[PDB]
Amino acid sequence: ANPYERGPDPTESSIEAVRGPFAVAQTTVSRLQADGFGGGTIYYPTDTSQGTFGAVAISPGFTAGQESIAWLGPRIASQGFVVITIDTITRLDQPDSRGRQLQAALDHLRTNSVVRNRIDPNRMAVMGHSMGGGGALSAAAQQTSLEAAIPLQGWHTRKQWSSVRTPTLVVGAELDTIAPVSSHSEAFYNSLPSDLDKAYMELRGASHTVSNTPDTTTAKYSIAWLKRFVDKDLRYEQFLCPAPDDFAISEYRSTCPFHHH
Ligand SMILES: [Cl-]
C-alpha cells in the first residue's frame, strides 16, 4: 500500500472542485520572517489523521505580486498539500533568483511552527507563473530531490533542461505573446530528458494571464500531477494517461505511461 495516498478515490469532478476534501487554514510569513524570499501565505490541511503531506511552493512572475497566483494556494492545499504562495524579494527578480526563492520558501516550511509537523520534508514540489515558472525549472535543476515541477507559461532565457530529474508538467498558453510556447514552454519540454516522466499541456485560446485567475484546467491537472508525483499516487494517473479530452487543451504530449514502483 502507498503510505502517501490522501483523500477519497478521485473523479474528474473531484479534481475540478474549487475546494478539495481537506479543510484548510492559513498563516502569513512576513517579509521580515522570510529568509531568502519576500514572504508568503501558507495554506495547509487542518486534519492530521491521515498523516503528513507533501509541500509545494508557488512563485509569481515578473512585475507581479503573490496575489497573481494566490487562488492556487487553497485550491491545491485542500487536495492534501501544504502550499506556500510567495512574494519575491523584488517584483523585478529574474528566473534563477526566483528558483532560489522557491527553494528558500520550501526550506522555511521545515522550521515554521505552524506547519513543520504537517509536512513530509522529503516530498516537495515547485510551481510558478511566467518567470516564476522559469524559477520552478531552475529550482528543479538545482535540487534533483524535488518530486514535481510545474511551470505555468514559463519564461526563461535558459532553454536547455537536460539535467532535470523531477517529473515536470509544462503548461503553455496557445496564444501567449509574453512567453510564447514555441520559444519557452515547448522548448523546455523538448529539452527535458526523453526518459523523464513529463507532459506538455497547451491551453486552447489562452493568453499569458490565464494563470492569474481561476482556471479549472490548470488546477485540475496541477492537482493530478502533484498527486501522481509528490504522493506517488497511482489513482491519479488515469487523468493524465491517455491524453485528456478537455476542450480547454489544444495540445497534449507526454511520456505516458509514467514510471512507478
Ligand atoms: Cl499574452
Residue numbers in the entry: 2 to 262
Show passages lifted from the paper:
Plastic pollution has become a global environmental challenge, driving interest in enzymatic polyethylene terephthalate (PET) recycling by using polyester hydrolases. Both the PHL7 and the PHL7mut3 sequences contain three putative N-glycosylation sites (N143, N144, and N161). To assess the impact of mutations and glycosylation on structural folding, we used X-ray crystallography to determine the structures of PHL7mut3, expressed in both E. coli (E_PHL7mut3) and P. pastoris (P_PHL7mut3), as well as a non-glycosylated variant with three additional mutations (P_PHL7mut3_ng), also expressed in P. pastoris.
To assess whether the enzymatic properties of the E. coli-produced enzymes can be reproduced when P. pastoris is used as a host, non-N-glycosylated enzyme variants were designed by substituting the asparagine (N) residues at the N-glycosylation sites with glutamine (Q) residues. In the P_PHL7mut3 structure, electron density supported a single conformation for K233, whereas two conformations were modeled for the same residue in E_PHL7mut3 and P_PHL7mut3_ng. We therefore consider the observed flexibility of K233 in the other two structures as characteristic for the enzyme in solution. The difference in the catalytic properties of E_PHL7mut3 and P_PHL7mut3_ng might be caused by the N143Q, N144Q, and N161Q mutations. This difference might be primarily responsible for the observed catalytic differences between E_PHL7mut3 and P_PHL7mut3_ng. In contrast, P_PHL7mut3_ng demonstrates a significantly lower initial slope, indicating a slower rate of PET degradation.
